[PDB]
Design a protein around this nucleic acid. Structure first.
Length: 283
DNA sequence: ATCAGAATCCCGGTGCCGAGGCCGCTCAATTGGTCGTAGACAGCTCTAGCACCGCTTAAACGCACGTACGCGCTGTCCCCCGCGTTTTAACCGCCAAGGGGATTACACCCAAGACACCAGGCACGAGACAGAAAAAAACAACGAAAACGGCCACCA
C-alpha cells in the first residue's frame, strides 16, 4: 500500500521541505523514493543536497457502469477502478455528459454496475451541472440530494491550482469511501495558461507530475480516475490505461471507439445522450 | 609694403574741493596702589605609542594585447558683431514734507549671586541578540556566437 510522506520527516528531512513536496504533489515515501533527482531539484527552493537527502532516506522506508449497455459491453462492463481512462474526442462528443452520468453511476451498488462509493468532480471548464446529476440519479432511482451530497465539487482555475486540489483530495479521500474522480477539460488549462512555445517544458512537467499523482491516487484508494482531453500527447499514453476516441454522429447520438487497450479489443459502440442518462442508442 | 582713418597719448591751461593744517577742549589713557587667583612649576602615575619579529596572503606590479577614444581635418550654416538710426528715460537740479532715528530721562523686573538640597544622570556590570561572517545558492547579467531573418543585387 501507500506510505504517506509524513513518515519521511522522521527520517530527518526538515518539515518545510516535506511541505514543499506535498505542495508539489508527492504524498508518500513510495512516491518520493522511485523518482530521480531532477523532479525534486526542479521544485522551487530545493537544492541538489536536499534532493539527495530525500531520496536516500526515502529508499530506507520504501467496473463502474457507464449506463450505456453498448458502452459497458465495449468496456467489458465499465471503467476499471484504480486506473486512468482517457476519452479523447472532438467537441460535442459527450465527454462532459458521460462525466455527469458516471458521477452518479459510481454511487450505484456494485451488483448494479457501480462502485458503491462517493464521487469527485474537479471542473476546469464550468460545465458542471448538478441538475444533470439529479437526472442521472432519477434515471436509476437514486436520491438526487444524496447524489449531490456524495459528489464533492471544485473548479480548478489553473494548472497549479488543479494540482493543488489533489492535496486536499488525497486527505479527504481517506476519511470517506469514494469511487470516482472526474477531471473535465483536464488538458485545457495546460493550453490556456501555458500558451507560449518557450514555456512548453513547464506545462509538460506539471502535466507529467499531475498524471503520476493520478496513477498514485488510483492505486492508493482503488477509485476510478476519469480525465477528459479536447482534440481540436504521447506522454498520456503510459498514464491512460484505456484510450477512447469519441466522434459525433448527427443528432444527439455519438460514436465511441477504443483506440488502445492492452486488454480491451479495438472496437466501437454506438450510444446516445439522453436527458436522464448516457444511454444506448435507440433509433 | 602702403596708406588712410580712427584711436590713443601727450602737453598745456583752468578750476575746484578735498586734503592738510591749526586751535580749542575733554575724556581716555596713565600712574600708583590694593587684592584675589590662575597658571607656573614640581612631582607622581601609568597609558599608550613606538619598536620589533614572524607568519600569511592579498594587493601591487610588469607585461601582452586589443580597441575605443582623443585629436586633427572639412564642410556648413547661423547668429553675433559692428555700424547706422530712432527713441526714451537716466540723470541733474530743485523743492517739500514728514517720519523715523537719535537723545534724554525715568522706572522696574529680571538676572547674577549665594545658599541649601537632592535626584537624575553617569561608570560599571551583565546578558543577549542583530548582524558579521561564511557558505551555499540563486541568479542576473554580459556577451560570443550562432541562427534566423530580413534586406538587397541581377536580371529574368
Amino acid at each position: 500500500g501507500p506510505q504517506p510522506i509524513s513518515r519521511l520527516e522522521q527520517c530527518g528531512i526538515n518539515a518545510n521541505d516535506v511541505k514543499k513536496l506535498e505542495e508539489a504533489g508527492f504524498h508518500t515515501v513510495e512516491a518520493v523514493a522511485y523518482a530521480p533527482k531532477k523532479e525534486l531539484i526542479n521544485i522551487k527552493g530545493i537544492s541538489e543536497a536536499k534532493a539527495d537527502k530525500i531520496l536516500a532516506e526515502a529508499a530506507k522506508l520504501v467496473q463502474i457502469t457507464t449506463g450505456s449497455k453498448e458502452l459497458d459491453k465495449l468496456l467489458q462492463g465499465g471503467i476499471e477502478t484504480g486506473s486512468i481512462t482517457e476519452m479523447f474526442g472532438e467537441f460535442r462528443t459527450g465527454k462532459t455528459q458521460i462525466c455527469h452520468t458516471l458521477a452518479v453511476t459510481c454511487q450505484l451498488p456494485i451488483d448494479r454496475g457501480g462502485g458503491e462509493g462517493k464521487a469527485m468532480y474537479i471542473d476546469t471548464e464550468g460545465t458542471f451541472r448538478p441538475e444533470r446529476l439529479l437526472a442521472v440519479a432519477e434515471r436509476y432511482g437514486l436520491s438526487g440530494s444524496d447524489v449531490l451530497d456524495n459528489v464533492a465539487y471544485a473548479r480548478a482555475f489553473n494548472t497549479d491550482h488543479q494540482t493543488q486540489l489533489l492535496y486536499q483530495a488525497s486527505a479527504m479521500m481517506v476519511e470517506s469511501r469514494y469511487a470516482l474522480l472526474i477531471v473535465d477539460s483536464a488538458t485545457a488549462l495546460y493550453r490556456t495558461d501555458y500558451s507560449g512555445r518557450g514555456e512548453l517544458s513547464a506545462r509538460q512537467m506539471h502535466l507529467a507530475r499531475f498524471l503520476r499523482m493520478l496513477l498514485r491516487l488510483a492505486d492508493e484508494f482503488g477509485v476510478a480516475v476519469v480525465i477528459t482531453n479536447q482534440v481540436v500527447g504521447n506522454i498520456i499514453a503510459h498514464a491512460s490505461t484505456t484510450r477512447l476516441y469519441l466522434r459525433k454522429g448527427r443528432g444527439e447520438t455519438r460514436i465511441c471507439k477504443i483506440y488502445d487497450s492492452p486488454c480491451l479489443p479495438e472496437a466501437e459502440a454506438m450510444f446516445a445522450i439522453n436527458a436522464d442518462g448516457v444511454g444506448d442508442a435507440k433509433d
